């Protein structure tokens, strides 16, 4: 408590979580579909980005709601939550999948 | 309602 140059900022816990999520590369393909571990997903703006690779963040405890990111101006930007179609109801862990 | 959709075509020609 005495040896801190300044008291740390109270981190927004969703931001911590978002940067704790592991991530993979896939390309949005035809119809705004993207494959990830046999599941398929889509979200509210995906199809406009069909044809290029996007960065998407996943939590192995619940893969059903992916967060997907574009790279533009060589900067990361969030697109939308890509939901596993028909599974937007209860959680699925990666290990059984 | 606004219109019958088929009736608009006969109105429009």
């Amino acid at each position: 408590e005495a040896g801190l140059p300044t008291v740390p900022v109270p981190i927004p816990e969703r931001d911590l979580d978002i940067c704790l999520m592991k991530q993979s590369r896939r390309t949005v393909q035809r119809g705004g579909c993207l494959q990830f571990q046999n599941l398929m997903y889509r979200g509210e703006y995906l199809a406009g980005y069909a044809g290029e690779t996007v960065n998407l963040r996943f939590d192995p405890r619940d893969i059903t709601t992916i967060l997907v990111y574009r790279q533009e101006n060589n900067q990361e930007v969030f697109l939308t939550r890509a939901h596993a179609q028909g599974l937007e109801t209860e959680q699925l862990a990666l290990d059984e999948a | 309602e606004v219109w019958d959709y088929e009736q608009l075509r006969e109105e429009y020609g």
């Binding site: 199809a47 406009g48 | 429009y12």
Partner: protein, 257 residues
């Protein structure tokens, strides 16, 4: 007979004056004034086509004796893989001209000739994503050589096509979004459908929360799901002697989607 008439009616189609429609009409009126090309983008069955149809009907051709018609708004819905002659075919036939067999150059020159003098101010291309990439050059030339606001309408499939040609992307950058209904807007919309579309002998009270729960779940707020579900449930009800939608038949319909 009552039953056959009500089914033949309610199998039909009608336009409801939703807020999304008025919002597009005010935006299209601005773009038509400014002659500004733009795009209308939104998910399937959000009502974009019906709202663009409603706009050209508000802006009907003006007849003048012995002239060709003054047609401020042209609306076209191209066939799949629309080539340039297909596109010129669509526009000239809309203006009440017959095409004559000929070259692409003849079709282009004739189209430009009739877009002039019919006084066309706005060209709406519904499902513009069906255009071939070569066809967008002739759409840009319409927008650029003539004072015509071109409006490309599509789903996000359109934006995937637009981004593949910088010159299209930079001309049609201004956009309006059609989104899902929610909240009060969904509640007032279902209330209007029961009041002014279903027209049944008895009130269905779809506004009430335990029916609204069914409609909200099945429709996800898409107006086209809402319309098709309630008409199907009504036709089922009237066929089985129910003078209203009942929660069971509503639940039966919603289960199929």
């Amino acid at each position: 007979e009552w039953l056959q008439a009500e089914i033949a009616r309610l199998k039909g189609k009608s336009i409801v004056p939703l807020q999304q429609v008025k919002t597009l009409h005010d935006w299209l009126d601005g773009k038509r004034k400014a002659r500004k090309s733009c795009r209308v983008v939104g998910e399937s069955r959000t009502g974009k086509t019906v709202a663009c149809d409603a706009y050209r009907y508000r802006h009907k051709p003006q007849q003048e004796a012995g002239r060709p018609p003054t047609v401020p708004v042209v609306y076209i819905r191209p066939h799949q893989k629309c080539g340039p002659k297909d596109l010129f075919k669509k526009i000239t036939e809309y203006l009440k001209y017959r095409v004559t067999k000929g070259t692409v150059s003849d079709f282009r020159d004739r189209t430009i000739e009739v877009l002039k003098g019919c006084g066309v101010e706005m060209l709406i291309i519904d499902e513009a994503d069906r255009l071939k990439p070569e066809t967008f050059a002739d759409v840009r030339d319409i927008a650029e050589d003539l004072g015509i606001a071109v409006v490309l309408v599509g789903t996000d499939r359109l934006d995937a096509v637009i981004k593949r040609d910088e010159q299209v992307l930079e001309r049609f950058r201004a956009h309006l979004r059609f989104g899902k209904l929610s909240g009060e807007d969904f509640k007032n919309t279902v209330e209007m459908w029961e009041q002014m579309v279903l027209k049944l002998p008895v009130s269905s009270n779809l506004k009430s929360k335990e029916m609204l729960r069914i409609l909200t779940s099945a429709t996800e707020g898409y107006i086209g799901r809402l319309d098709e579900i309630l008409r199907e449930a009504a036709i089922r009800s009237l066929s089985r002697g129910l003078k209203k939608i009942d929660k069971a038949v509503l639940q039966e319909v919603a289960k199929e989607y």
